[model samples]
Target: MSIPCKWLKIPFPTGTTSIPEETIPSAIVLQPVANENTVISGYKLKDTVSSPEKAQEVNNKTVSPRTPKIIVKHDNSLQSLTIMDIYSQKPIQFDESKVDEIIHSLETKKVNLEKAIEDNNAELSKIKKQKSKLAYLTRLYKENKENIQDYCTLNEYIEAHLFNPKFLSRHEKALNNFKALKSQFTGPVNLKELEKLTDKLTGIKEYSYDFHSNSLPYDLEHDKSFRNFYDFDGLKESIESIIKELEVLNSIRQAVSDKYPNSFKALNETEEHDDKLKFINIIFNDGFSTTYDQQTFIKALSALDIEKAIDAYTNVKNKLENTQDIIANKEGCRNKLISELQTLIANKQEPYLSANEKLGGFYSKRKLSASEGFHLAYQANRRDPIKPEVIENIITKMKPIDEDTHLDIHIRPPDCGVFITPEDIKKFQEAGIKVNITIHEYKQNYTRRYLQQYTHDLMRQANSVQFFNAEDRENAIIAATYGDCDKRNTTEPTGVAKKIREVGEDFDLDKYPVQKYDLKGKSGLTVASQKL
Candidate 1:
């Protein structure tokens, strides 16, 4: 194998015995070294030193002998170098001055190459920075597009509601501005433009809801379609009031249609009348008219006497309107009283709870019998006129039911209320039981009634109880005594029922032939719910 060396030797042609001595043309050459680490071997050419006349004679080959010396020049600041040499008229020799000149040339060349590399690095750094900014702008553009979709949905809603023109104009401007900003996505990024787009989107979101105002169309106020669009409580009040008025009108129309079917029959299509007559016949046969007025109205309709039916219809209309007015007035008072009741309870609920807990300790310990508990409760509440009247109002409204469900009479203080828990309702349904939860209010007091006649009958057929425990007996005494106090006028009942009695040979339970308490007073607010 061949190896690397500084020079390669070549033999002369075979026919030539000796080399001919002859003058040869020469040329002055300038050689510059390549960058470091480029050359594998340690070989370099020496710096040339020759006379000016000889350099000129070499450069003047094939030309005039008066040719100027070939120059080599280097400029480091501009990273510029050229093949032009500076020469002297004297004979040049390899000396100390010539070596220093060569050394200077090498250093200048190194600095020029270093500058070139650093310049390339600077360009690379700038390119990477621009690429990162483009990525950020791309992400921002995507987010802005998603945000615009929400505003588009909101705009659809506003457009359906006959949105304000000023809002529409603003929205249009936003849309156009977004379109303009989108065109710039392919070019250099403007972060401020993206921010402006975000601000515009926020403005559109907040400005979307201003349609339902006094200055808007009358239909906007009366129409029920936009009710869910507002969150204002006062607006809810007016909207609900309008709905109720509409309901009343609907009820009045239905009343007229029911009383005079022929009038509606004359104007309506045939299929609806066929369906109407079907239900009407079923209703008439289903024992609909148990009341005198209902019976009269139904009888007049069945006999086809339009004159009599019209007379009853007028009476029915007047009655409905009068009832509407009464119901409206009642509701007004009910709401006012409910507000007052809540305030009163909130004010005294804490103290009432503390006192009730203290009394409960004695009752739970059996230190207070049911009747004694009632007595102490009355003593504690006697100073408050509201308590007795509210209690009276609640009791007067409790009518005896005809069902076999065990009637449980509960006597609750002003601070107590009854609410069925979720598990309680679940258990009832699991047992196939129905319950009526009735709540009646008076001032600061509430009474809850449980009619288990339905449940009672079922249990009776399954099993019956003739006697109860001492606890239940005491509870019965407490319930009766607490309810029968009747001090609405601040005067005790005449011949009030005794709280306790002993069964003996000579003893007879005290009985009253007439009702003990007045049942004429009306309750203030009664809320009722029945489990399905």
Candidate 2:
């Protein structure tokens, strides 16, 4: 639609603007080229000599100004601002937008590389922390770009528990519980007040006992009260003077407490009038209470008798002692006369305590009575004597003291003894002495008479026989050898009685009169015994 200024145009012809007007236009002053032929186009630029304007005047225009005549000012090939000889490996479009994209990528890469460097530094830190067991801790994950899970687990183990809400809650609860324990008071706290009351008197604040001493007043004791008191030193001789006769009475009461049950079970079970009478004789007086019941009796005993009862007892006991002393003097004289050659075998001349340096065993002056036991002891002591008539003559001439010398054997033997030794007791038992009759081991070889009772006991055990006195047992053995039961009281009369046969041949029923079975508790079959 329009001719561009940069393009060339050719005119068709030249002409004036008006016919009568003289040409005065400046527009007529400019002229376009007239050569349109090939002749001008055909001339080469070399024909004009490529800048061959040698004329000094023409150099400024022809040489295009400002190169050194020989070489140049800016040697672009060598200097820093040098232009690239080749644009690139190859060339296509001059796209400035693509160049801009390359610069942007380099900058972003720098940022990421910086972060990687920082990560390496942090891992180095982790190494030192590990060696030190540093209190501070966290994952080395970001520094190393490692696994998320490993860091989380390691982080939990090494740190952050104190910061946990639940843990703080638990710690608080524990403190509260400990405070409760500290605040509580739980036992016999009244002890403090008790100590305040008694520390001045007993000088014991704790009152806890010392079991090793088997004592209490040193560390523990009952409450002290009036009348029931200990002077600890008042147990002494009192200065005594009296105008009238001052008679003191006494009863000895042993405080058995736990031991009473063991010692008095036999006493508790004994029911005979004589036995019970001895029990009552020891009972002091109904002038006061018995502390009657069993439990009460055990709790407190070890007391003394009333002064009245003691006065009576002292006289009788003194008289008996006097009697014993007189007997002992005579016995001592007899002991002086004895020698091993004068040995006696039976328990006839025994004294309260004796050591006959040259004598063998002998009966006491009183081991037996003139009655049953005495008669036995007497005949038994005479023992294989070289001369019985001389001993009888000696017995007949024996003298007595001022008191009538009659004996009543009802006091079931005085309980006096010496603890010889274990081996000696066994020796006596094996020797058939029954040295333990009134002490312990009552069944141990208790003499021929006790053995007789004991054998009667055995016979009853078999349910086969009974006896009058077991003198009956001794007497019937001969009858039994001939098949006679003339004396045994068993329904069959069979302990020692069944072996004898009838001399009469009538085989009589009433002819065999066995003894009566009426000794009651004393003569019945012995009750079953306790175990060893």
Candidate 3:
């Protein structure tokens, strides 16, 4: 149906052109016709002005007429086109011209949409091919993972094992397999990963294969220089020769120790000699030197002979045995003289026994062939109470071991070896009579056992004096441990002075108390010496 506002044509007469009145001459009526040119096919006929006055009235109001409101689907799906008055919001019935116009516009847009769809399909096809290629590359990387790592591991594994007999063959097999696999990678590989593996493999190769030569002596020499510790026949022979020589040296040491055991305890070979044998292969095998000479070789070889070492140690030991026998005999005679002196003091035999009068006088008169005698003289400083002048006087008469003499004059403020009150000894100790024993002659200084007996006597005296505090007693007790067999050291401190100095700058007498040893029943016993 043709929807609304179509103009119908009517014929109108201007002059003679008139409608024909058939028979009866029906008054020759003619209706005026609107012009054919007034036809507007695409326009709606709402709000038409019928007269000029009507147009003027509308112009006088000065209000513009609203165009019809419309809503259309952007998708152009051919569903519906809505029409409404803009102000009133009332839906207007769509005219045929407006509907036809909307259809024409949507049909043109549909053609452009179809062209866009074709473009999208072309781009999607290109993306799909790229995705397939990328996925294939990812799969290739994953599939070759174990093979690449195995090749790298084997390349390094053969480097350190180059010492094996089949090393070169296995090394070649690793190279061939790696090259074959590496060639299969068509494009650029992961260059950093490849370079890292190659760098480490090259590093191992330099240390293992480049360091050695083909010749037996050259290889052995390099092994020694690098501390590789490989063994050979001549190396074993050299060790055996050194071992035999060392055995001879050890026998000499043992034989000397058997005769004079006390002096030879520290002379025994140390564990350093054992460790020397462990590395003697490198030490004595001087063929490794480029400037290896017969003179240099003889010098090192001669040290292993040990003939000089044997003679030096044996002569010292033999001399020490004679010295030990002399000192041992002196200790016995000295102890006898000490006993006799103790008896004389208890019986009030002499005010002060003089070695030059009775003790040394006897030795001076009776010079028995191959006979040794020791004399004791006790000097009491309690009656005179002098300063260190007594020590100075006694020290002036000191005798050397080579000199023909046998006398000891122990000087103290106390009258004798009997126990004096702690106060009485303290009075004398304060007066510079530090219970000092002065050795006048032959005291057997080498054999520490003989010296320790003198210390034993001093300790017995210390224990005898009833001490009020162990501090004074402890000083004298520990002093006995360091033997006074040699000439007394008046310059350097001894006994209490030495003990107090060793406590150092932090010497708090109250903080670190003197530790007392068990000397009640063990007073008569001397300190033990190691048995041979």
Residue-level error in angstroms, candidate 2, position 38: 99
Tens digits of per-residue lDDT for model 1 on 1-532? 1101112221111111101111111110000010000000000111233223322322222111111112111110111111110010111122224434444433343343334334434533454554353343333323543243222222222232233353344344534543443343333333334333322322211111111110112112222333223212322233344334334434433565776566446433434545645555445454444422443333333333334323322332232333233224354532332233223222222222221221101000001122222222222222222233333333334333234332222212222232122233333333433333222221111121121111122222221222123332332223233432222211233323222222432343322111122111211122222211
Off by over 4 Å in 3: 1-243, 249-393, 396-468, 471-518, 521-532
**Per-residue lDDT for 252 in model 3?**
43
Q: Candidates' TM-scores?
A: 0.17, 0.15, 0.13
lDDT of 3: 0.27
Model 2 lDDT, full chain set: 0.24
Please, what is the whole-model Cα lDDT of each candidate in the order they appear?
Answer: 0.27, 0.24, 0.27
Instruction: Report the C-alpha displacement of residue 69, candidate 3, in angstroms.
Output: 99
> Which stretches in model 2 have alpha-carbon errors above 4 Å?
1-450, 460-463, 466-532
lDDT by residue (303-370, candidate 2, tens digit) is 12224323432332233333323234354432322221122112112110111221212111111111
Higher-TM-score candidate of 1 and 2? 1
Per TM-score, the best of the predicted structures is 1
